[PDB]
Ligand binder design. Structure first.
Ligand SMILES: CC[C@H]1OC(=O)/C=C/[C@H](C)[C@@H](O[C@@H]2O[C@H](C)C[C@H](N(C)C)[C@H]2O)[C@@H](C)C[C@@H](C)C(=O)/C=C/C=C/[C@@H]1CO[C@@H]1O[C@H](C)[C@@H](O)[C@@H](O)[C@H]1OC
Ligand code: HEM
Length: 393
């Protein structure tokens, strides 16, 4: 009587029709995931936003619960597993340093890196793999600039970082060695910056103060690695998926070639429209019984608040399945909502705007080098995206 979940097919970006059916007839429903507990699934925009914003729905139990999910292992810890006040304290120190102004200051380096990537693509000739050569490269390098990794170390840091992608074909010991190298490198950079500060994010994190509070050595280290993992695969997949949409919907490419100033707006519309997750991750837990759409969620039960479905809710977004690059208003939940709202969103927006700007300007004719129906799609079971995007231009 729960439904098998996830509903989305991983081989594409289609939103399962089941979501809209539940938005209509069962907006709070039971689901059985592949691993972990059965959970409530919430699908209307209004309810999803309400759950993400509501004090009674917490993430701390994540640490001691068998979370509904699609893969056997649980990746636990980080900001997303904490609740106020502990969460509030760390996030306060991190945003003091990782400001939206800092994000914007990286646009020029981000463009430069994007151009370098496109150079390497042109150097090997059509078709090139846009995933391997651009999408998997740009977001990890930008994180290198953000943190303050010296230029000479970008290549190895990028190499270690790919072991963390859910699509990586590496043994656990291999991923483990990549992780210990990343941690040792990051701990050493943090110690350099303490004694000799620069303008980078690591320096600013080392010096963040909040009425006399500061980040501990371990906090600095976990937060820096945490930003890497939170900021890499997500942005990489979303770059791939936006370019895939650009290449397969000519009207979308034509609109942005004609009016490149629409790119920020298109980034928001695509973030709304693409149901990037396979399912919804990061169940919330009820701290007390809460009634939602006349169903009582009992204290202790997990709730999956689907932003994928929320973002395509006809009640909130006129003609919600239409991609409209000028869509206004566009109060989408693609970067989440409430205290855990994506802290790298300003940087994610910069990156996605730059990726589109630079590819469109360098390769206005970029298109698939194979037919659509032959694309291989990631089965990592966390995010949806193509494994390879061979492109011609
Ligand atoms: C997708 C967004 C998310 O990405 C992940 O959740 C990825 C987690 C990876 C699947 C995980 O790898 C898998 O583990 C297994 C032990 C073995 C698998 N293997 C041997 C084939 C390996 O492929 C985890 C453990 C990787 C580690 C380094 C990790 O913590 C990643 C965190 C990413 C978080 C961010 C978000 O916020
Ligand atoms: C297109 C790319 C991205 C998307 C779609 C995205 C989406 C999200 C979403 C939906 C959340 C909320 C998760 C939830 O509450 O369940 C989140 C949180 C978070 N994101 Fe992102 N994100 C992206 C890029 C980034 C980048 C580039 C960084 C860091 C530089 C980053 C760092 C974080 C962190 C640290 C959190 C946890 C915040 C907290 O718990 O306080 N993200 N992101």
């Amino acid at each position: 009587e729960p439904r098998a979940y996830p509903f989305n097919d991983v081989h594409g970006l289609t939103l399962a029709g089941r979501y809209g059916e539940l938005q209509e007839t069962e907006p709070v429903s039971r689901v059985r995931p592949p691993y972990g507990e059965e959970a409530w699934l919430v699908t209307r925009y209004e309810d999803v936003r309400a759950v993400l914003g509501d004090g009674r729905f917490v993430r701390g139990p994540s640490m001691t619960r068998d979370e509904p999910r699609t893969r056997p292992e649980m990746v636990k810890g980080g900001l997303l597993s904490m609740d106020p006040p502990e969460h509030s304290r760390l996030r306060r120190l991190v945003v003091k340093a990782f400001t939206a102004r800092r994000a914007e200051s990286l646009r020029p380096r981000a463009r430069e890196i994007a151009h370098e990537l496109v150079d390497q693509m042109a150097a090997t000739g059509q078709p090139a793999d846009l995933v391997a050569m651009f999408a998997r490269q740009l977001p990890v390098r930008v994180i290198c600039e953000l943190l303050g990794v010296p230029s000479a170390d970008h290549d190895r840091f990028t190499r270690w970082s790919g072991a963390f992608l859910s699509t990586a074909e590496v043994t656990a010991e291999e991923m483990q060695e990549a992780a210990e190298q990343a941690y040792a490198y990051m701990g050493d950079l943090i110690d350099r910056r303490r004694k000799e500060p620069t303008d980078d994010l690591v320096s600013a994190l080392v010096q963040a103060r909040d009425q006399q509070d500061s980040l501990s050595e371990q906090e600095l280290l976990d937060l820096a690695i945490g930003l890497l993992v939170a900021g890499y695969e997500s942005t990489t997949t979303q770059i791939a998926d936006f370019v895939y949409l650009l290449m397969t919907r000519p009207e979308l490419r034509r609109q942005l070639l004609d009016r490149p100033e629409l790119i920020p707006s298109a980034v928001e519309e695509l973030t709304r429209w693409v149901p990037l997750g396979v399912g919804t991750a990061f169940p919330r837990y009820a701290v007390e019984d809460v009634t939602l759409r006349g169903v009582t969620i009992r204290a202790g039960e997990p709730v999956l608040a689907s932003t994928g479905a929320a973002n395509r809710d006809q009640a909130q977004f006129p003609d919600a399945d239409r991609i409209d690059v000028d869509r206004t208003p566009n109060q989408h939940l693609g970067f989440g909502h409430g205290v855990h709202h994506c802290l790298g969103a300003p940087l994610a927006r910069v990156e996605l705007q730059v990726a589109l700007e630079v590819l469109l300007q360098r390769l206005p004719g970029i298109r698939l080098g194979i037919p659509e129906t032959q694309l291989r799609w990631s089965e990592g079971m966390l995010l949806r995206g193509p494994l390879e995007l061979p492109v011609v231009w």
